[PDB]
Structure 1
């Protein structure tokens, strides 16, 4: 065949992961889309979809799930039956940045209030368990002049390597009839020593020491 080189194979894979990500964030953003995970296996390409509500994505007898399976097989060139799509429901969506970023975006597009919707998600982030979150909305807020109001509560790490696996940042655009607004959501993941809830690796500044376990001094043999 074309004999795809490895330097161009990983790129062609990462673009398929990126283009499928953007296509679903513009199509499944209503059902609570959170991402996809791919597993390149010959004759069986399992492409799982992570959403908050999967009962509505299915349909009466799996109507919408058949379309997306027939959607990527025709745009990326997958054979008939050679691609299989699965839908999974995630938990504790308050830790997912893009889940909470699209959540308040669908409520800010109505002009109801920018302080009620922001405080509405701040409680769910803390209720689901988090070490701090961030909500930033910029643009012509409450006037023609551009105004930015930052909503901070808890803790937040900005520098270092742990910012990759301890805090996830999401950016979304707001389409209003008066202008354009931005949405910055920064959720901090709780340290889970197991690995099921969030990150397993602790912070570098987590020197916390175990107790000596009441070391007793012997008196006589």
Structure 2
């Protein structure tokens, strides 16, 4: 291509391609079991895969709410006509995905269930899935005006060292209420 762009700008312009594609698909597919993307560039195709759970409810009316995203993303990054395709595949071993469990918490909380209930409703699910340890941490104002940070931990959990990169998982989600704001950290 004659735009004759360097290499450093290229590895950045595609790091930003992945980052805008995740912030935009997160801020919209949150309640529908969203878990991230993984892009694949070919000789003139691009197969973006939504790593969701409810794949039937993320197509809408027979691929409607996906064929809308097909012409949105083209009109955004300026792609050619039909160089993108969207597969919406389910995530296996659903117990170990953090934003996948945090959305089920920020809608179990919104539906008015109490906190000590739903913390055990996540924690029993992710001890059932076959993991080792968890550190579900909730903060924000609770049945008062002074704040207080709760926590629920069992199992085994490491904090320091390099192996935090490729063992553990980390998730943060704000959740809103009419009275205030609660926050969730998962480890």
Same fold by TM-score, threshold 0.5 exceeded? yes
1:166 shift after superposition: 1.0
RMSD of aligned alpha carbons? 1.2
1:69 shift after superposition: 1.4
Secondary structure in 1 matching 2:160: coil
Cα shift readout 1:110-155 (whole Å, capped 9, x = no counterpart): 4421111111000110111100111111111221111110111111
Cα shift readout 1:48-88 (whole Å, capped 9, x = no counterpart): 11001111112332111111111211111111111111111
Secondary structure in 1 matching 2:161: coil
| Structure 1 ranges of 4+ moved more than 2 A | 109-112
How far, CA to CA, are the matches of 2:116 and 2:3 in structure 1?
A: 55
1:97 shift after superposition: 1.2
How far, CA to CA, are the matches of 1:23 and 1:101 in structure 2?
A: 18
Q: Is the 8 A contact 1:138 1:182 kept in 2?
A: yes
How far, CA to CA, are the matches of 2:152 and 2:185 in structure 1?
A: 10
What corresponds to 1:94 in structure 2?
A: 95
Gaps of 5+ in 1: 186-221
1:170 shift after superposition: 0.4
Gaps of 5+ in 2: none
How far, CA to CA, are the matches of 2:129 and 2:113 in structure 1?
A: 25
Q: Normalized against structure 1, the TM-score is what? A: 0.80
1:176 shift after superposition: 0.9
How far, CA to CA, are the matches of 2:127 and 2:101 in structure 1?
A: 12
1:40 shift after superposition: 2.1
1:161 shift after superposition: 1.4
Cα shift readout 1:159-179 (whole Å, capped 9, x = no counterpart): 111111111100000111111
The structure having more radius of gyration, on CA atoms, is 1
Q: Is the 8 A contact 1:141 1:148 kept in 2?
A: no
Secondary structure in 1 matching 2:57: helix
1:94 shift after superposition: 1.2
More strand by share: 1
Q: Is the 8 A contact 1:138 1:148 kept in 2?
A: yes
Secondary structure in 2 matching 1:34: coil
Secondary structure in 2 matching 1:51: coil
Secondary structure in 1 matching 2:174: strand
Which has the larger displacement, 101-110 or 169-178?
101-110
Matches within 5 A, 1:77-156: 77-156=78-157
Secondary structure in 2 matching 1:184: strand
Cα shift readout 1:161-209 (whole Å, capped 9, x = no counterpart): 1111111100000111111110011xxxxxxxxxxxxxxxxxxxxxxxx
